[model samples]
Target chain A: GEVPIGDPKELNGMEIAAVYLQPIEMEPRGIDLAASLADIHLEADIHALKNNPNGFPEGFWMPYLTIAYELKNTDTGAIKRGTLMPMVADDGPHYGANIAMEKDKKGGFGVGNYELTFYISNPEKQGFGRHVDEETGVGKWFEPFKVDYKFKYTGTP
Target chain B: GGEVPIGDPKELNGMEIAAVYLQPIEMEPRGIDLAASLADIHLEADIHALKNNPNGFPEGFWMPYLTIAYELKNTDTGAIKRGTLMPMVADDGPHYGANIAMEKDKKGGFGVGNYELTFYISNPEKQGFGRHVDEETGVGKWFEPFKVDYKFKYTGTPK
Candidate 1:
């Protein structure tokens, strides 16, 4: 009468539950992390990379001209790109960030460990209110699970 | 009986991406005030509360708080999340808003400000492909796209 199948729950791949990344600056003093209003403009991305741009590799010629791209869901918050890279947690040194750092453009995108988060959407149907099954008064909800990725003056620089 | 037709991959809005909260403080000796324990509890529903507080959101209702949150948080970082949204835009906001910004208590428990861009594009043919659609390049270039239903935890907490 009926046939069993794999992915029978009728499930496919999952959504980008979430995304996040933080670049913690390491200096003898922690103060090196924060970028001044003057050092770098603060308009989020519009202003991001604008000041500290060292685009492309082979061309170290442009010490301050860089461009890094992370594919994001754009549907959530700042942590747009979710689980695209390998997530590993390891302690490393915080390289010096200063003008010499700037010649290499060392610091100031407004420092500290940047955090990005993502929320996977239901591929089947609306999950919020619908999850509240009055019959059970008990509905299953998603747990906020996360993975970490760290970026430090490359940590070695 | 007839066979179903497959279609193109759904077009997601430019603004449907979200921020990915860190797991924990990986590098110390460094400082990042986690007054907002976003990293501690990645998808806590009340995550917005800790960060946004009174203005943010409160925990409870769900163990996992931070899911899709207000887009205002994404202004800084440069990473893309793998979300299954409707790829639809918002009429409420200026541009096509995948998730609308609200002040809580507006649309169900969502409250409003840039909730998750959680709508699904149902194209029976476009079934699978959870986050990204993998395709082959060379010669036989057959494509299969899919759709999603916006799902997440919300607080019944009134605004």
Candidate 2:
């Protein structure tokens, strides 16, 4: 199931584009979805809201921030939550990393309208330091925040 | 502890390889000190792009879909440990891009001693990335498997 929740949204100091594709097999071998109806790859492409600050690498995607997601079925009212890890693919990096969506006991997320909420936490709590000096200062991180998106899962192709 | 580069970068077929190791905690997610003590530290390998390669791996991108295995031997104790290293990423972004959180041998942990480490790298195609080999639109064949060795001394445990 390839679904783009919506257009990119700006929050805190970053822009996030959320999307989901077919479930992918990760390394270490044992990480796989249990008997499920619909398993999808949840990812967020995050970019700095402003220009790259000093000390940051070129083409840098925002890092050190914790990203999590909650998906609720509008019809059934069921919810699923999980953390997204940092990951890269052949195409390049996915800022929020990526994770496989949890499947309901009934098998899969039934086709319907779903509300997805992304909880983004500040990098400061994770020990990401900012350059506060006069010459190389990058400023402070934003407070934790969440964004909501509504999308319809038309079922996997 | 600081990282020590293993050996002179070697090139097999067309891929150039260089590796290094440091305290495992140094590679923890978000640079947090989990303090979860383990047998071994962290090992990372850098595979560079070749001018004539078809996959078009960039300098910053770690070549994906390859199997990396290691064999470590303690010369003083006559102990050895062998295992495959899982490719991983940390929150700080592509630091080393590709790495393995090496583990201690179940028989015993890596104590202070002289040690030798050998790494075996398998071709990426065997891992199944669907690189077609047809003459029309397919990419070139992957490099052959290769191995490299390095010697170092373990002073003490990492903080």
Candidate 3:
């Protein structure tokens, strides 16, 4: 739009398809209804940690990336993922199985955009059978987080 | 026998019973253990309830009978019928199963004689069978209290 600013802070505000939900509107899983996904402790905002600039240019906006990336590049472009405590909702099929819980409660806000598919644990895990672009569904696939779950409660046993 | 009297009112020499056996520990159509048929409870002494004083013993030795007690074995000398008190404690039975302790703590004793066995509920958990000691072969039984029928070295003709 206008000439870019001279400060080294534009990476935090740049526009791209990869932050938590610039291109991909964040969708919650493991919930039947929107009310079920509501945060009992609602979060206000999510700050951005720098997207990996190693393979990209200056002031490029890569809005969406996994938690592991943000957790690694904790230096420049780091800001709190503004939620006080982590609240999550998961889609039964896609989107998430990666759990983000309180490892430490001293917060710079515990927000991480995590996916289930990529992890050191449970290598060779499968994604949901079908998925679509998180934001547009424009003939694309949303690589969902992987989840390994077991239940012993009520069901068709 | 010479009459023995004491100025101090003498407490009772408690009575006893011997449990014999119960059969068919469990059964359908409701059953009962014959060993505890009627024998269950014995007494410290002949009970002195205000009721049942049919010319009660003048020495107040009116024989005590258990109105309610745990159904145990009655070691009767005679053939223990389905409902007959076992010939263990003085209390006649079908045994009401109250526990009998084998102890000789007290000494210089004159020894107790025949008693009748009576029966009652032990624990609510152990009882779902009917209260009336059934004539059936198996279902219910109470625990505790044994009877001695044969003669020991001292008492002759036990039971």
Candidate 4:
């Protein structure tokens, strides 16, 4: 599908957005398929904003953040939720991490309007350290928050 | 360096190891002058541990924070190069995770012949990701150091 739901938004000194693409296979032959029907590759793209308080290099992918999502089909009142992981590909690092989603057991996502919400949280809670020393100190991670987007799923691409 | 024993593509401890090579220019987020640089080829290591393993990480995510040192030898000329591979990520997702941009020799040439590549993967704890060994919640111990070898024929030309 390769659809970006909406324009990128700047939140807590970071640019965040989401996209959906056709489902693709993975490696490690034993773990290739997704858990469910494997509908779409839903991913989030997050980058550090300029002059970020956290001392992250501008435009670099902000690592160590935990990302989750909630997808709801407004037409049929269906819902799906899962966590996104930090992933890398041939291009470079990916901040959003991604997951495959399925609308129902009989078929994949149905063609209809949908709402997607992302839950972003700090990393310290997940055991990732944040520097606070005088030489390496950086700003604190932003508080947990969510953003929502609406889009239409035409069908499998 | 001396010759090391070659091992087959198999699981060591809990992790799996495999290797592949392609043109350096094929790497994304291309480096400046990478096409004209001495790096004629790119080597990648596909390393991963099972999600249900002791570490409890995800299934497809690259095994993070381990040292991977490589030794590449050209069988025809007796030339060898040694260096460490870096963990890399792309905008799309994670590939093999560890890779190195390589050149034929110190003077720079094309890697267009048969070669043997040896990889030595050190213990993950050595990099500071220690495992809990206490009786309360400890589950498993870290794996010992191991190595794997692969032979490939490089057919890529310098860009």
Candidate 5:
């Protein structure tokens, strides 16, 4: 019996994990995600959509919100980071995604302060339209005109 | 078994404190000690309280704190096997004690399955904790509890 059975050993589920949604303007608006408690699902409403208020255009370009986010293990500072592009959908966009550890894996939701840093631009102008010099390399790689709609959350998994 | 509110007038007198985050670590026996390397669960939060000005305050102030408990349950039957309350933070800080060792009951010492983990942070007294002295001298304070529930699964095989 001693040879057949052994003392318990340690085991685990996944290596690491994290995720975020798009079309969010969380400057202190929405609440945090509480695994199975608060809906981690994100969506947008454009019924009364207005043009870009950052002096870009009027009544044409919807506010295209972009964000970079990460999830982490509070104990070890282990993290998972990524970006998302959320455009406005008046009637419905209706898309979904899931964040889970690998099959037969075990781990925490990495509870801690995770922030979503939002960047702004117009779908009308995806890239830079400014004049540039190829030789001098002044505005050759014109970046998108960006702004902030910073949103934050505390994770619990 | 349940809870008791904390609102001693002397308890509310200083800078308001809040639980910025929560990190859970699983444990296993190692000789006479336990190790916290099974897995780590982290949770972060931001809450507000009132204090005497420079900033702003009424006749008093408020702060927040958390009291957590760990519970193991049966996956198929939905019944709890055992549970243990987490130790409160010793001083004014956002971290847990260095030695928070845990062990499951004999029914099945946190065997490979699922468990129920709940985080609690609430104020027992309806009135805010702490006291308000003359504008600059007050120091007593207490905050309400914040609560959240979570599921923990163990999919690894016994070593």
Candidate 6:
């Protein structure tokens, strides 16, 4: 059941997709009950594995997806950051993922437009999936992709 | 004679370039005179304007590296070529003697004649140190420029 042929086709569609967000308003959301809030939402047709049987994805040294982004407060110059670790989810049906860093500390979320910088980094070559390398017999992973988006932040929430 | 700064001053991440110069060291009186195919010169500067706190870092702290370019020019005719520096030279820290040897052999060696040496200091043109924030203030900033001129000259009479 395990062998190495390492055919080139084994490398198809392994690339990762770039991170991006939907078009939204850049207005700052006011504090509600003294709670500072910001939410970065994303929806994409991610290209990730659905499942792996033999050696548990990690056990086989597989690759997943990494999406990260930074938020900067333009007024006070303060900063808040968020990220999503690597994962292998189905292509479209999944609603995808998001980040919400609400602040209710010393003061409510600062008032101003925050700069958003988004980044998507993935291993160009991963080790998960149904394909196996012809030479190693071990499962093989392939091509990697990455993308980034930069624009002004929307409402506080 | 007198100094009339040439060209529009270069800018990198908004920091005003303080100064970039090649000081005369091993020499005669013609500004700088080289005795061999290469010469050791003291490279110095204060490129960081020291005023704008764009990176949100301390007053004196700057990113770890700066892109530096070297050039060789014929003092009389202004001929030019790519320049090189000594391994001992550094890309960071308070700009000073960062010692370096301008060898004629590099870039096919420099031609024997009066030559003007110049440097171009710049930012990587990418977001680097400017994103850091102060734990107490939550503020962030970035440098906004990429090119500054640094120049000098020497006599290439291989004597």
**Judged by lDDT, which candidate is best?**
4
Docking class of 3: incorrect
A9 Cα displacement, candidate 6 (Å): 56
| Superior candidate under DockQ, 4 versus 5 | 4
* lDDT (0 to 1) per candidate: 0.20, 0.57, 0.21, 0.57, 0.28, 0.34
Q: C-alpha displacement of B72 in model 1, angstroms?
A: 46
lDDT of 6 at B61: 31
Model 4 misplacement above 4 A: A28-36, A95-103, A106-108, B1-159
- Please give, for residues B91-120, the per-residue lDDT of candidate 2 as tens digits: 222323222223344565557778887778
Question: Which regions of candidate 2 fall more than 4 Å away from where they truly are?
Answer: A31-38, A52-59, A95-103, A106-108, B1-159
What does DockQ give for each predicted structure?
Answer: 0.02, 0.06, 0.00, 0.03, 0.01, 0.01
Listed per prediction, chain B TM-scores read 0.19, 0.71, 0.18, 0.73, 0.35, 0.46
The alpha-carbon lDDT assigned to residue B25 of candidate 2 equals 40
- The prediction achieving the highest DockQ against the true structure is 2
Candidate 5 Cα misplacement greater than 4 A, ranges: A1-157, B1-65, B77-94, B97-105, B123-146, B156-159
Interface RMSD list for the candidates = 22.8, 8.9, 41.2, 15.3, 25.3, 21.6
lDDT of 1 by residue, B17-125 (tens): 2222112212111122222122221121111112211111122101111123222221122212333212110111001111222222132323312223222222211
Question: What is candidate 3's TM-score for chain B alone?
Answer: 0.18
Minimal lDDT window, size 10, model 2 chain A: A27-36
lDDT of 6 at A104: 27
Runs in model 6 with CA error above 4 Å? A1-157, B1-39, B75-79, B83-93, B96-121, B124-130, B133-145, B155-159
lDDT of 5 by residue, B1-159 (tens): 111111111222222322222233221112211233432222222222334422223222222222334344546446563222322111121121222222332444444456554444444122111122222222223344544444545443222
Q: Find the 10 residues in a row with the least total lDDT in model 1 chain B.
A: B88-97
Distance (Å) between predicted and true CA of B24, model 3?
26
Native contacts retained by model 5, as a fraction? Answer: 0.00
Instruction: Report the lDDT tens digits of candidate 1 across residue range A23-111.
Output: 22221223333322122110111111121211111211111111222222122223222121110012100011111222223233223
| Deviation of model 2 at B11, angstroms | 10
